[PDB]
């Protein structure tokens, strides 16, 4: 099967670092330089073996054809009103980028407002963030190129879709918040740095500042409103209160759901926004999250996890701000996580809960917190919403494993509420009645019950004969909830597979306690949980190790890579997308310093001792047993992934190929593909998405020798 040779890759045997008395050799450290001829040549040599391997068998083209056909369905966002007009996103089916439309009424003719497709030949310029002025007459939007986190902000006048001269550079991880006087907008920027800032660099991002841009001026005139020069990792994002009176500053340091919350009463500024604002440091620590919902005068409603790991709503009165005085508007639930909250039609709240990994949606009274109405939903996720305080209606979008999506609408001016289907699309070719979704709870090593969704064809025999695709993430308070994936349903229908999603610890599925169960000293719980999900699928007869593929991205790429090292006997195939692989060095690059809240940092002996045990780069080892080799492995990354710098995958693949790939018993391939004009994934154009899933499933099909089922 392996009619190629791995490229020769220089080992710098002098690259040795002492970590608290533990010597670590890093012979591929040179791959950390993305601009070197050595690194470029490495990437070319790797792509030269991977691409023909993936393209060789007709199955890739069969998959690509079916993906192109089945993914070709109309895709809408929720409608949202801004000022006098309605907006929505829409993709006719296979456009590289969805397009923003505008209409003067719900019943009126729609026209194109912003079409990112016309900004590049290949769909590699994408919208990344936007904000309308409070009156809806002006529009700011971020553009990213080739999938980088870097943003350029541009501006338009809404009436006539007129491009304006204003351009803001050096924007990354930024807020966008207009003052209600319409004069200008808050945003974030980084100071100038040596080298490139295009997404190919690895330079750490520090000293983010908060600026205010006056519309009709040059960026060089922008006002500095907040900075933290003694705290280079702090990031202060601004929003205006719903009445326009207060700027709320949420300061973050790291990825934990916590923030400082300062405010500026804009009426108290001596002469408008002229410099550093008169911040009042309401919550001046990182002990809890305070997410603004709405205010009525000085009474501010926040969603919080302060002493409430499943989240709750509190009211803080700025005129009586001591914690003993806060009112608990909607108390914490014993098990269900309050995921997000919105205020609509002045005095309603819309609360979205997660109940055993499925969403529910409720309308409550702002004054008392009392439940008023349950919006009925099938089992799945709410993935879109609109309805702000001054608006009188809501839209929300529902999705599930088997359903592409339904957008509902509810007119909240009516005495009796009747939510109605507003938009629905059906994908022909995937008959949902042929399949089922089950949720089970399996015990992990330590006895904790972990949820898992399993999607499969109705009536299958549990005889271990089916290929399986088991997905996980496990970190950062991210909940892995049901979603419609044509790419995975093709695996089910056309490759006879079983899909599984394990809700392992580190995620947000059971609130902050679930997240803390998968971080820092307890990160190994993630891996144990995931290995146990695989063991369940095998024991219960869904699959067998040789037919099992595991997949994850980013922190989920770390997940599957670590699992490959720890239990190579459990998996036939491993696809790690944009994975964090070097756990000793991740904090040195771009925004990686922010991840130490989930991982720790190797500068601490205590943390090093956790990290060294599971770091994928540092745990590649030939299996002791003669009959065990590594699973087939494919790493996918891209040359502008400035979220997870691609050196992680480059150094990992070099290590896998040298330590394991050179062994006579290893016959499963260990490959990397590095894409061009792409990044971590957000904003990836449709064409590239289709190529990527075609690569993934062709790899699975060839390695496992799975026949296509037309
Ligand atoms: C990928 N997981 C990378 C590497 C490890 C952490 N990480 C982040 O991007 C990190 C965690 C938060 N995050 C996770 C994701 C992943 N989403 C996802 O893949 O889920 C599916 C939809 C596929 C199921 N996206 N964001 C935030 N993130 C950051 O690094 C944010 C940087 C900016 C920032 C913002 C606020 C505070 C600090 C830093």
Swiss-Prot record:
The keyword Transport does not apply. Ubiquitous. It is an enzyme of class 3 (hydrolase). Its main location: cytoplasm. The active site is at residues 554, 641, 680. Keywords: Acetylation, Cytoplasm, Hydrolase, Protease, Serine protease. The modification N-acetylmethionine is found at residue 1. Pfam families: Peptidase_S9 (PF00326), Peptidase_S9_N (PF02897). The keyword Glycoprotein does not apply. It comes from the Eukaryota. Cleaves peptide bonds on the C-terminal side of prolyl residues within peptides that are up to approximately 30 amino acids long. Belongs to the peptidase S9A family. This is Prolyl endopeptidase. It comes from Sus scrofa (Pig).
């Amino acid at each position: 099967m392996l009619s190629f040779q791995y490229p020769d890759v220089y080992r710098d045997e002098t690259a040795i670092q002492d970590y608290h008395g533990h010597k670590v050799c890093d012979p591929y450290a040179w791959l950390e330089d993305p601009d070197s001829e050595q690194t470029k040549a490495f990437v070319e040599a790797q792509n030269k073996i991977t691409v023909p391997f993936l393209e060789q068998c007709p199955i890739r083209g069969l998959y690509k054809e079916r993906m192109t056909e089945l993914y070709d369905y109309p895709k809408y966002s929720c409608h949202f009103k801004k000022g006098k007009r309605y907006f929505y996103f829409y993709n006719t089916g296979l456009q590289n980028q969805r397009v923003l439309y505008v209409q003067d009424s719900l019943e009126g003719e729609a026209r194109v407002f912003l079409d990112p497709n016309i900004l590049s030949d290949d769909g590699t310029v994408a919208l990344r963030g936007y904000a309308f002025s409070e009156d809806g007459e002006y529009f700011a939007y971020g553009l990213s190129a080739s999938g980088s986190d870097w943003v350029t902000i541009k501006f338009m006048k809404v009436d006539g879709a007129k491009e304006l001269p204003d351009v803001l550079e050096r924007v990354k991880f930024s807020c966008m918040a207009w003052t209600h006087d319409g004069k200008g907008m808050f945003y974030n920027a980084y100071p100038q740095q040596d080298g490139k800032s295009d997404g190919t660099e690895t330079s750490t991002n520090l000293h983010q500042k908060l600026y205010y841009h006056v519309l009709g001026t040059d960026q060089s005139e922008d006002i500095l409103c907040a900075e933290f020069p003694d705290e280079p990792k702090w990031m202060g994002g601004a929003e205006l209160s719903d009445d326009g009176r207060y700027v709320l500053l949420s300061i973050r340091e790291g990825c934990d759901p916590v923030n400082r919350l300062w405010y500026c009463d804009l009426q108290q500024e001596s002469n408008g926004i002229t410099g550093i604002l008169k911040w009042v440091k309401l919550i001046d620590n990182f002990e809890g999250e305070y997410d603004y919902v709405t205010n009525e005068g000085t009474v501010f409603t926040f969603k919080t996890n302060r002493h409430s790991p499943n989240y709750r709503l509190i009211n803080i009165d700025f005129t009586d701000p001591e914690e003993s005085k806060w009112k608990v508007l909607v108390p914490e639930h014993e098990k269900d996580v309050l995921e997000w909250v919105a205020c609509v039609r002045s005095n309603f709240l819309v609360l979205c809960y997660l109940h055993d990994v499925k969403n529910t949606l409720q309308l409550h009274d702002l004054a008392t917190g009392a439940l008023l109405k349950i919006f009925p939903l099938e089992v799945g996720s709410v993935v879109g919403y609109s309805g702000q305080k001054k608006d009188t209606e809501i839209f929300y979008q529902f999705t599930s494993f088997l359903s592409p999506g339904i957008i509902y609408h509810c007119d909240l001016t009516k005495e009796e509420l009747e939510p109605r289907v507003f938009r629905e699309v059906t994908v022909k070719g995937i008959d949902a009645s042929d399949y089922q979704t089950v949720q089970i709870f399996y015990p992990s090593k330590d006895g904790t019950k972990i949820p898992m969704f399993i999607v499969h064809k109705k009536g299958i025999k549990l005889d271990g004969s089916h290929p399986a695709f088991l997905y996980g993430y496990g970190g950062f308070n991210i909940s892995i909830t049901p979603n419609y994936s044509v790419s995975r349903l093709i695996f089910v229908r056309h490759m006879g597979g079983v899909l599984a999603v394990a809700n392992i610890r580190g995620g947000g599925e059971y609130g902050e306690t679930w997240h803390k169960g998968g971080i820092l000293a307890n990160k190994q719980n993630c891996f144990d949980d995931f290995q146990c999900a695989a063991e369940y699928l095998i024991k219960e007869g869904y699959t067998s190790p040789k037919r099992l593929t595991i997949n994850g991205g980013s922190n989920g790429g770390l997940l599957v890579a670590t699992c490959a090292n720890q239990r190579p006997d459990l998996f036939g195939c491993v696809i790690a997308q944009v994975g964090v692989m070097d756990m000793l060095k991740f904090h040195k690059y771009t925004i990686g310093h922010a991840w130490t809240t989930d991982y720790g940092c190797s500068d601490s002996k205590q943390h090093f001792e956790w990290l060294i045990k599971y770091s994928p780069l540092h745990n590649v080892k030939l299996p002791e047993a003669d009959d065990i080799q590594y699973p087939s492995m494919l790493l996918l990354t891209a040359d502008h992934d400035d979220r997870v710098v691609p050196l992680h995958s480059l150094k990992f693949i070099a290590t896998l190929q040298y330590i394991v790939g050179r062994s006579r018993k290893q016959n499963n391939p260990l490959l990397i593909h590095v894409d061009t004009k792409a990044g971590h994934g957000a904003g990836k154009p449709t064409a590239k998405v289709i190529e990527e899933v075609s690569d993934m499933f062709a790899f699975i099909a060839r390695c496992l020798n799975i026949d296509w089922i037309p």
